[PDB]
Design a protein around this ligand. Structure first.
Ligand SMILES: O=C(Cc1cccnc1)Nc1cccc(O[C@H]2CC(=O)N2)c1
Ligand SMILES: O=C(Cc1cccnc1)Nc1cccc(O[C@H]2CC(=O)N2)c1
Lengths: 304, 304
């Protein structure tokens, strides 16, 4: 027993982290096969970031202007191209450490691990969720651009995020591995603001199931509700509307615990309306929304 | 910016994880050089655990009775010995993936990463602290015994914990890599209880410094206090007494922020006496004690 914000083992991803330097700028790159993926703002100077024309800026860049280093060895860049907001640097050596990988665009609500990196070197790993407003609440400093978000299935790494920027509000914006930003964010140093951050209801429910499994049963009440009535209370508290798909995904958790999804919803409705009264759930004084129903089953069943 | 419970990259430790089977029992082992370290309760049956005589039980065990598997390859055990509560299985092949390592016994209050494992395979990584009562609040299921706690410095892994058991209260007990339990715990299926779990004051202070660095400044007040007055309030709330050593270790955080340690103590005294009033600090509705002052500087400076 015990419930922690667990991240996937990062070894398969550490093997891919490289340092990419363009002029004065150094950031991280992802080396899979003979391609190094990195944010395209590596070709920018601090003046360029205000209003950059990336096609024009890339025209003044040649293969030799991009310095790629993997540990202490320099990789020869034989080609370069721009795919949306990522640069793909073709290198002459394929990464011998390349794991089985997929490039995937995750949905908001879904979770993933981040391997924060500086100068192509990993500093730490933590679990994140793609917020409904398409930002992530990460831990990133200047120099962490190019750090990737990933999931692991058996031996296959699904890369879903590449860090590009921080908004003045302290939240982080980034792209999938095809260079497409999650949300309305543009890789320009212009005032951008994240919209309303809503709470991932299905994840809070999954974590309530995880608390019941672990012994925290105080919040369980003698009540039930309907999907429409629960959603009236979810609306007021900026919670994502619960759908029958969500109820379905909670099915294995509901089946294991023996608590109906709508019963857990009534318990959640009371937690929203009445607060926690100074008590805690899984050592947390607030309702946690960064565990998907898949994360809960995986952690409560030891899926390696 | 952003502050997360970050764990060290686990790649160097994944390379050491092996599966150790003795009779019907399977658990994890740590393969460093030609030695595999694992909990000695691997030689026990469910009946033996009630009151085991490990010397007598080991006398009926031979080199061939311990099955060690690293991935899909069986390792030949050429020697076996008991060091306190760990078995050291000498194998004929040295681990080619052995990183630079030290075996260290950490103090309560200190933090470390755990690579939870099942059948010699890593399932996830998370950050932990050694509680003042010598237990850890981990996430472990049956089959995770042998999972290790570690820290990383540059390229050197300092192994500090090996998971052995779970107490009926849901907390976890284990040993250093010399087989010595942290705390009064014995590897026997007998009713054991953890003592009072106090709050690591210096870590809560370090995390208040991390909140100030990150923009959360609401809790800052126009007051100060003395070490003895603060400790009167720490005592009432089961907080560890603050010493001049703690004030010293907080020195670089105090120097960076410009807030005196005793000033932060007055802010903490008010948080203890008045609560958080529904507000949050670093997205947490309670006072976090699992970040050391070293963890704070490392995360707020990008130490790879
Ligand atoms: O933020 C970083 C580096 C960094 C520092 C700290 C943490 N993570 C990333 N770069 C950057 C890149 C592209 C646009 C950009 O403009 C900002 C203004 C806005 O809203 N977005 C900034
Ligand atoms: O707990 C486990 C396996 C396990 C299961 C879930 C999570 N982590 C570990 N084994 C074990 C080993 C040695 C003594 C022992 O007795 C318990 C009674 C007590 O207080 N300690 C139990």
């Amino acid at each position: 027993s015990g419930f922690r914000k667990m991240a996937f083992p990062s070894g398969k991803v550490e093997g891919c982290m490289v340092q990419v330097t363009c002029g004065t700028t150094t950031l991280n790159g992802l080396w899979l096969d003979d391609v190094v993926y990195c944010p395209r703002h590596v070709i920018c100077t601090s003046e360029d970031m205000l209003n950059p024309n990336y096609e024009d800026l890339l025209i003044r860049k040649s293969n030799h202007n991009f310095l790629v280093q993997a540990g202490n060895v320099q990789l020869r860049v034989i080609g370069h191209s721009m795919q949306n907001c990522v640069l793909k640097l073709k290198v002459d050596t394929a990464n011998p450490k390349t794991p089985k990988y997929k490039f995937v665009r995750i949905q908001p609500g879904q979770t993933f691990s981040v391997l924060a990196c500086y100068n192509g070197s990993p500093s730490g790993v933590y679990q994140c969720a793609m917020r409904p407003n398409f930002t992530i609440k990460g831990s990133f400093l200047n120099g962490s651009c190019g750090s990737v978000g990933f999931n692991i299935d058996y031996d296959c790494v699904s890369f879903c995020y590449m860090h590009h920027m921080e908004l003045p509000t302290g939240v982080h914006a980034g792209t999938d591995l095809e260079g497409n930003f999650y949300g309305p964010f543009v890789d320009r140093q212009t005032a951008q603001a994240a919209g309303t951050d809503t709470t991932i209801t299905v994840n809070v429910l999954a974590w309530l199931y995880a608390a019941v499994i672990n012994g925290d049963r105080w919040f369980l009440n003698r009540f039930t509700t309907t999907l429409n009535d629960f959603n009236l209370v979810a609306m007021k508290y900026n919670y994502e509307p619960l759908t029958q798909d969500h109820v379905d995904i909670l099915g294995p958790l509901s089946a294991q615990t023996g608590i109906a999804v709508l019963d857990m919803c009534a318990s959640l409705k009371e937690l929203l309306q009445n607060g926690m009264n100074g008590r805690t759930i899984l050592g947390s004084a607030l309702l946690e929304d960064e565990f998907t129903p898949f994360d809960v089953v995986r952690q409560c069943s030891g899926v390696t």
